[PDB]
Amino acid sequence: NWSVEDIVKGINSNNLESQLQATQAARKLLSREKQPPIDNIIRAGLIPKFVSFLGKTDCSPIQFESAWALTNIASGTSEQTKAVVDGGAIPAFISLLASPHAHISEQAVWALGNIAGDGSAFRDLVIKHGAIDPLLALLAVPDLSTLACGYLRNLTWTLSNLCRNKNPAPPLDAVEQILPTLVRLLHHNDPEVLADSCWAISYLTDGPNERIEMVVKKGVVPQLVKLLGATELPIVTPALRAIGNIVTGTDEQTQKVIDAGALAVFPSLLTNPKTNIQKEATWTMSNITAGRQDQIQQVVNHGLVPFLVGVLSKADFKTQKEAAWAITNYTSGGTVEQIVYLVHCGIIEPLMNLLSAKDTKIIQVILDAISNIFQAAEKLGETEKLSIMIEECGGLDKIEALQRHENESVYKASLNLIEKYFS
Amino acid sequence: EEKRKR
Amino acid sequence: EEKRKRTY
C-alpha cells in the first residue's frame, strides 16, 4: 500500500534493490481490482524508468515487475497505451521475448498483445519492430501440449490481436507468416486456445475475398465446422462468425463450407437460446440463399426452410430482419419449384405480419421478396391464387397502407403490386 | 442479388 | 476483450 510519492522516491533512489521494491509496489498498485492510479503513475514520469528496467538482464525480478506494471498501464485507455509505446516499450518487450525465464517472456507477450490490440496503428508498429518472428519462435515445439497452459493461451491471444482490426487490414506477408501456426493452434485441444484461434480466423476472413481465399487455402473450413458444433459457446461464437465471413465470398468458398457439413448444425444454431447466435446463423443463411441454385437446393434438402420460416415468425427483430434478407435472396435466385416449396412451408403469413414493422429497410426487402414470388406465380400462372393467400392473412391491408409514406421505393413497389395483382 | 458483408 | 489487465 505505497503512495505514488514513495514509489517515485524509490525509483529515483539509484539503488537497484530500492528500485525493485518501488517497482513491485507500483505493480501491486496497478494490480488492484478497484480503479488503479494509472494516470498518476504516467504523470510521475515512471514509464521511461520502467522501460529502462526491462533491459536490466542482471536483475530478472525488476524485469518481471516492470513488465507487469507496464502491461497493466497498457491494458487501459488508448492514451495510456500510447504513453507506454512512447517510452520505447515495443523494442524492449520484443527483446524480452527471448528471456530465459518463462514468466518474463510471458509478460512480454502479454504486453505486446495489449499494445497491438489498441488499433491498426500500434498493431503494425509492433509488426514493423519484428515481433512476429520471435513470437512464432516461442511455439517451435513438436507438441504444443508440452507448453504451459497459460503460456499458450497468452501467445494465442497475442497472435489474435496481431490479426485483428481492419482499416487497414494486417499486412499480407504477416498473415502468411502467422497462418500455419494459427492452424496448429486451431487443432489444439484447449477451449480458450480454440476460442482465440477462431477469433483470429474470423478477423482474417472479414473483408475482400482474396483474404477469405488465403484462409481457406490452408484447409481450416472442416475444422471450423467441427468447432461450430462445440458445446462451449465461447468457441461456437467465433467459429460461426468465421463461417459467416467465409460464405460472403465466391460461390466456390461457400461450397467449400457446405461440403464440410455446415448446414447440418444450423437447425441448432437457428434455435439457439442466445439471440446473437441466432442472428449470426440467420445472416449466414442469407448469404447462402444468395448463392447458386444447387446451393439453395442444399439448404432445402437439410430441411432448413421450416427453420427460416420459424425465425421469420418469432425471433429477435434483428434476427427477423436477417431472415427477411434470406427469404428475398432465396426468392431472387431460386427455381420456380423452390419458391413453391417456400410458400408451401408457410412463408406468407409471417412475411405479411412483418409489414407492420417500424423499419423502412425490412419492409423494402419483404416487398421486394413479394415481387419475386409474384414473378414466380406469373411463370406458373397462379397469380390470383397467391393474391387470395395474401388476402386471407391480412396482407392487402398492409400493402394498401404502405403504398403511401416517406420512402420512395416503398410506395413505388407497393403501388406496382396493387395495380398489377389487385384490380 | 448480392452477398452482404459486415 | 481487446485489452487485458493482470489482476495478480
Numbering used by the authors:
A (entry chain E): 75 to 497
B (entry chain C): 289 to 294
C (entry chain B): 435 to 442
List passages from the publication reporting this PDB structure:
Nuclear translocation of the p50/p65 heterodimer is essential for NF-κB signaling. Upon activation, p50/p65 is translocated into the nucleus by the adapter importin α3 and the receptor importin β. In the classical pathway, importin α binds to importin β through its N-terminal Importin-β binding (IBB) domain8,9 and to NLS-cargos through its C-terminal 10 stacked Armadillo motifs (Arms) that collectively form an Arm-core. Importin α possesses two NLS binding pockets located along the concave Arm-core surface: an N-terminal ‘major site’ and C-terminal ‘minor site’ between Arms 2–4 and 6–8, respectively.
